Design a protein around this ligand. Sequence first.
Ligand SMILES: [K+]
Ligand SMILES: [K+]
Ligand SMILES: [K+]
Lengths: 8, 8, 8, 8, 494, 494, 494
Amino acid sequence: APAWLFEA
Amino acid sequence: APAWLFEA
Amino acid sequence: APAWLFEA
Amino acid sequence: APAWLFEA
Amino acid sequence: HHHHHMKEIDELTIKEYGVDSRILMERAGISVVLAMEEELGNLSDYRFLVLCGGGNNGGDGFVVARNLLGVVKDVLVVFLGKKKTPDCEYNYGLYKKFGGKVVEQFEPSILNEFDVVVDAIFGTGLRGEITGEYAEIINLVNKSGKVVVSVDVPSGIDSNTGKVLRTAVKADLTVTFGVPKIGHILFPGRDLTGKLKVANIGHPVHLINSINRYVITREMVRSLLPERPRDSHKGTYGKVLIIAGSRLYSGAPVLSGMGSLKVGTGLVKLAVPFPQNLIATSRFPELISVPIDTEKGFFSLQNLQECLELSKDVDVVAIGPGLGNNEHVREFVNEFLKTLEKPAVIDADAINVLDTSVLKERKSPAVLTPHPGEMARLVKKTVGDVKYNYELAEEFAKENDCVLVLKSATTIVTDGEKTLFNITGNTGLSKGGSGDVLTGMIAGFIAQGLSPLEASTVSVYLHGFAAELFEQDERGLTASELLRLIPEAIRRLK
Amino acid sequence: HHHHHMKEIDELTIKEYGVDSRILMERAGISVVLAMEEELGNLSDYRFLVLCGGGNNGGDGFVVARNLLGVVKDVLVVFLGKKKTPDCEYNYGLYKKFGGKVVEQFEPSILNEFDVVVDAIFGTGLRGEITGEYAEIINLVNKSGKVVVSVDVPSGIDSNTGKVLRTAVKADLTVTFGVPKIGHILFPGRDLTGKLKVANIGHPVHLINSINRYVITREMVRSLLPERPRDSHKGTYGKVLIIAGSRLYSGAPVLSGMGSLKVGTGLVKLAVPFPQNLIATSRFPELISVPIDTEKGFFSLQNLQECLELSKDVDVVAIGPGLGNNEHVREFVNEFLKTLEKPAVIDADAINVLDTSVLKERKSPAVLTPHPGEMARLVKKTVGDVKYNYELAEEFAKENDCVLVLKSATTIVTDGEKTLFNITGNTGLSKGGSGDVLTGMIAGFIAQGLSPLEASTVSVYLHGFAAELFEQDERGLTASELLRLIPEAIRRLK
Amino acid sequence: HHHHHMKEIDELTIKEYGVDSRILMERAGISVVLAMEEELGNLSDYRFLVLCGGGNNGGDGFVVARNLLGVVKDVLVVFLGKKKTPDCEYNYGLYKKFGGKVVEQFEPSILNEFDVVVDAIFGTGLRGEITGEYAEIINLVNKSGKVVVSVDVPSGIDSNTGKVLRTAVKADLTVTFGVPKIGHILFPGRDLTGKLKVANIGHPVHLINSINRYVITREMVRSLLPERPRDSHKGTYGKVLIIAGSRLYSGAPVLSGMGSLKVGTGLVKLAVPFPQNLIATSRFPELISVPIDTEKGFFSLQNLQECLELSKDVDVVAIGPGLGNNEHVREFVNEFLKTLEKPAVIDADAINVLDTSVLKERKSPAVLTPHPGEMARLVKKTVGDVKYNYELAEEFAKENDCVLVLKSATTIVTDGEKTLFNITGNTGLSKGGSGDVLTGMIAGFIAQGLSPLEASTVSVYLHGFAAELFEQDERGLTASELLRLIPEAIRRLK
Ligand SMILES: [K+]
Ligand SMILES: [K+]
Ligand SMILES: [K+]
């Protein structure tokens, strides 16, 4: 999952 | 189609 | 479920 | 389609 | 005895059959509630604004309002009249006794706090233009974006003609009682009706069936489609002659001919001025396209004898598409029809040059298929005076002993005694060549044994239904594609 | 003001709200027609025999018959009365005016020419045993194999009790008006009702809601299920002590305990005579099963102090499953309950030895969960006198300040003021161990904060619903499998 | 006030709205990162080589590089400039302070140790041909086979024209800021851009909307498509005359006519020299194809009066496809257009013989539809000077009071004030007959009520979109199949 901006 | 009440 | 006329 | 950041 | 109106039907059901008027009014309102539920789903989360006039339409509205009390999120009646009919007063009284809130002042912002508007202002009792408070309110509802449900007829539509009386409600759903009204069927009314449901409210069924003007239905057309006995030959299915075309209009004969063949006719012959006749077999080699030697590219009296000879061996003659309209064509058309002792389907340029005296003297039947411009020129009136004018169409058919098929988005089919309305089709049919196809279909069904009226009824329905089956945007439909779709329309009808 | 009966509701709607009785009767009959259509599909191919009595049930039948005229294959009314109420006379008159055929003689072979029987003979006005012509006709309909539709109540069922008055119609579909009647809910009536539809015929909604006896519904149980706040610990969800078992009945404590845990209780402790206490943790090690040293394998007064001590640290105490019923148990049960200042759920052998004086003197609440044999022994009556006897249950609960849960296929839950009927379940629950589970569920819901009445309501519904979720034949259901199904029943309820 | 360039928009956003230039630069770089993630997925396993120039494009590159630090496998910046703008210096400083590695020497083998190249060398600040170190590096990147992501514009493309300034980066993905640049839209730039994403970096929305040159979008064309009111007739949807064809070019009239009909026009008439007129109705009999008697197979002044007569009863006239180009055609075309008081769509051979003085004196509007060879001959310039020359097109349209539709892979549509660029289509349209279809579409939309500019906008979009819907290889597309696809393109647009 692309996670440059957000960590869930 | 049951049509006692309504004709479309 | 539409129930103006009937409750089951 | 959400497009706040990008127009394709 | 036939009965033009629901007014006579209601009166008989009350005064002769003995059904209390209040029972009819209750049945009307509960049918609106049920219809709303079919269309919106569960009603319990919605807020309803019911707009009631002082007549029995408003009375129906009070029934609706009262039946929603305690079951939906909110109900409010705005009573817009100055007095109440007795049944309206009775149901107003019930609504209040059950806890219902009525206001007599309409505040523009009131639309904000509701989800559904129930339009019970005017029904069949509308008389004259709507103005004043009534008009401002109707204009506010049409700008509101809310769900609109009209009781019997959208307020502002003349239920006998479909005309708008200054302004009218645009409904998402119209629930009408007993039978559709003419104003649901003809435009602009048809457009403002939105989805139409016809509710049985308890009239005796034979009174409902006593109505003499009908919408053409799928079931009616299914029962009229001719039988195809297995042991048959082409002659079983009739022979059509099409007299059509000119040096100017070479395509019309082709569309008319294939229109006959696609509905199951056994043999189709065209008579077309040479060399334009060769256009037809170049596209569809199953057609017979007889070359007619003309002086200047148009039918004239010099072709009278040859056309009458070709007519001897057919069942029906279609005439008019692409003939042109000059003096030589007029003499030919009128002398031919005067002499032809076969049913005739008369279209386009044959209508433009027609001497209606000739129809009066013909022993054989005729179907005429004008659009309103052609009808207007035929009776010497304005387009606006003949358009959707079913009474004038009836008078014309009766006086001239023909079937008249007045084409428009809703097509009127009449022999002067029975009138049928067709609502199948779409705007892809508003394009050159569409009418030529229909002419062929009618002649084809006549050749197969249907009466002129039956042939016309089946043909207008199937022609519109074929248009609806087009797979891409309707504005791209052309007559050649409509032809391809006819056999699918037939299959689907069965 | 609450209203025991539809009779009072009908009267108020007519006399105080002002709805004409004929409007109610029309709404009743059209609701039967609509219900038939939902159940049979299109009515047009069916032949209907409508059996009408001389009261308003027969009047409703005339409405039905008249509304089918001209729309179905055939309609015939057999009028079985000697006279007609005014609304029945009115609708009989309408039916004939509309062209309907009535006969007054019932011929056994008449059943042959019809597909559907509409049973409009007796409704709520039935008084006394059915005999004579009426009975022969009902017996002929029940042997016929036709589709049977009953108007309001199958004829022959006492709408207040559910008893059969000599003979009664067995219906495939019953359409009732306003609210279910007690005779649809209790057996044998429940069985003869077949599929029940409850129709809104126009009574004010607050009068309909004024009824004080209710069927327990999914929506009602959903709204009562306790919240599970995320920031919680076992104490949030309560603690239950179960005092149960004996050397003879070692399994009961286990089923009761797991019944508490499966409904979400935080801590469950059993007190069970040693070594039978070890049975419980051998099957379910999440239970605490405290060993009680007994003289001969049964609780006695020598265990009084230890049980009261264990009760101090719990929210609710369940007592009775598998205790046995001898004199030493009776002294223990009664002294314990007299002293226990916690809510108690009293079942099985604790009911069999109960001194009802003790309930009268308790400050804390109690739920009792008898089957009819236990109830019978408790009030010193016959099983036949207490079975489905909701008035006696109400009187008992009110006089003894408890909640009474009278178990049967339909279970009655009452505190003397409010009475609820449960219709979930199946015959897999007619098997040892089923009741033990329910006892645990009730104590568990009380421990989680529901009132004794609310706990009982939710528990009887979910216990029956869990039984219905069993995947194989119901007769194979055992209590251990019922336990496994409880959490699925909960999930499905949400 | 409209604003030709992002340069003016950036300046206003900084100097008048007060957004720090560094905030715009941060928003630009993070938008590149997000775009890369949408296109590559998770970035964490990739190694990035970021090539930065000394201007603000390189500054954007430093933002990108810094934002990848610690999150991807490796990051390296090659700084290729001799000095740095202030924002570039600021972000270079941040990148190093965050631990980032910069080198100033480009080693050919460096491409080997990276997966993605971020091209931040030159953006809109490119001036003149690229040579030297810069060129060798761009040539090395284009031979590398790595994934290439360009910041704002691929380096080497002139953002105002789309021309390559000696050499340019071929990108897989270009992320541009605020609005597309002309160099993304016109070729060769369009080809080198690869996938284009347009990022919002914080400019006020009304400044972004102040741009006067637009890409034609699906949403724009959807809002311009004319309404199809249900109550309509063929005249509602307009009438077109097409004056086309010759003994040499018999097919063109057919394609143009069907182009009008497929977009929903009500009536289409062709005027075509006899006997070539019969070709049209042989293929599509819904067309009217009027025979024009000519001396040698071409329109001449002897046909002037008949064409003007036929024009009286139509809404729009299309002229030119297949007319031929000799002196007699030139006299006819120019005298006809000088006299015709209807909108005209002027194509092909009518453009080749056109006296532009005639356009200046016409009161009625005109659309001209040249390809670049035709445009070149029309203004007496070389093909290379007019191709993609939108300023010249604007000047021509303004000076001659027409709409100019300059056809190429990207088609330019302009009235001199507003210029629109179309990017739909494929190489199947590079084939005889394609243009003839478009001419018909434009005339058809004008006849339906769209302005010449609106008609041209909708038609070029739908003509290209129809080509893209062809199901097999684009090189096999022919005009006849393009016609079949038009109604699907319309459906899909809705
Ligand atoms: K209305
Ligand atoms: K009954
Ligand atoms: K760049």
